[PDB]
Write a protein that binds this ligand. Structure first.
Ligand code: ATP
Ligand code: 31S
Length: 284
């Protein structure tokens, strides 16, 4: 087990409502890590322990190039530490906001990586439940690094569990089924995927309003529009993901999974193998 004095801390990378992520160098290796730190008193006081434990447990299960890797964990008398790969280029949302929207080649490439990641995650019987540009980081090579697994769910294989009951998510990306049926499924992530593709091309997510309730009302009514100029095959893909019936979204188990999704005409030119070894297109 590593200790805090095994590291030299540098700048703070960001701060959550009960966590701090700090850039750290390991003295014995000179390796860089992003260390997530929570105060035991705070999580003990604010009933956050199940989230801490969840994040650890879920990240321990992941072994794939498009996720933030968990390398190690430790604790002292005041804090819990999560040793993570450092995503040098930060959040995808930053780039969306900076350039306003992605061209077709970039939209295709980053959508393909997110599909690849979700194929992996769902293959392991895990639902993310809070997929959004803020939670998709970018490494030094500008490949994606999905994060934020404290609100993920490992579905039980023993019971062939399909639905998750905890109420979690972000209003702009939350699925109609969690709102109306009060449970989420793997396909709830595909709804988020549709929202993100939309956002990449249009510059904003499709259901938006100045408070959550209004957004909820738009979601359950499928109330949204495409801007006049939206890549047509991408619009078709979005219309196949933003479907109220969760059993009818392209990529869901009832539609026979990721095969048909990866075969969508929007991905015609994609080479799905060793995606993580291709040079990403420049966002420019
Ligand atoms: N592995 C990482 N590499 C680089 N930056 C990271 C990494 N992990 C997190 N960050 C950055 O640090 C910020 C804070 O992360 P953290 O998970 O502690 O809180 P959060 O999830 O943003 O906040 P909240 O809990 O309120 O949602 C993130 O928003 C992200 O921008
Ligand atoms: O690492 C270890 O060896 C052990 C643990 C479990 C120990 C533990 C003891 C008391 C409390 Cl209140 C919470 C966790 C641990 C440590 C860190 C995290 C962690 C998870 C997410 C963010 C930051 C830290 C989770 C469990």
């Amino acid at each position: 087990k590593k200790r805090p004095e095994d590291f030299k801390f540098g700048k703070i990378l960001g701060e959550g409502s009960f966590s701090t992520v700090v850039l750290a160098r390991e003295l014995a290796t000179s390796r860089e890590y992003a260390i997530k730190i929570v105060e035991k008193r705070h999580v003990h006081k604010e009933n956050k322990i199940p989230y801490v434990q969840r994040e650890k447990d879920v990240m321990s299960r992941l072994d794939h190039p498009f996720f933030v890797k968990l390398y190690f964990c430790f604790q002292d008398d005041e804090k819990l530490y999560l040793g993570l790969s450092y995503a040098k280029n930060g959040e995808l949302l930053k780039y969306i906001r900076k350039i306003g929207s992605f061209d077709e080649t970039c939209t295709r490439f980053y959508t393909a990586e997110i599909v690849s990641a979700l194929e992996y995650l769902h293959g392991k019987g895990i639902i993310h439940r809070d997929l959004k540009p803020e939670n998709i980081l970018l490494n030094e090579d500008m490949h994606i690094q999905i994060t934020d697994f404290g609100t993920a769910k490992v579905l039980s294989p023993e019971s062939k569990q399909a639905r998750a009951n905890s109420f979690v998510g972000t209003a702009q990306y939350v699925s109609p089924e969690l709102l109306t049926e009060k449970s989420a499924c793997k396909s709830s992530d595909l709804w988020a995927l549709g929202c993100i593709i939309y956002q990449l091309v249009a510059g904003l997510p499709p259901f938006r309003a100045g408070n959550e309730g209004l957004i909820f009302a738009k979601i359950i009514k499928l109330e949204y529009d495409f801007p006049e100029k939206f890549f047509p095959k991408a619009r078709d893909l979005v219309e196949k993901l933003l479907v109220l019936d969760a059993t009818k979204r392209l990529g869901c188990e009832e539609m026979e999974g990721y095969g048909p999704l990866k075969a969508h005409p929007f991905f015609e030119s994609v080479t799905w193998e060793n995606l993580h070894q291709q040079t990403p297109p420049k966002l420019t």
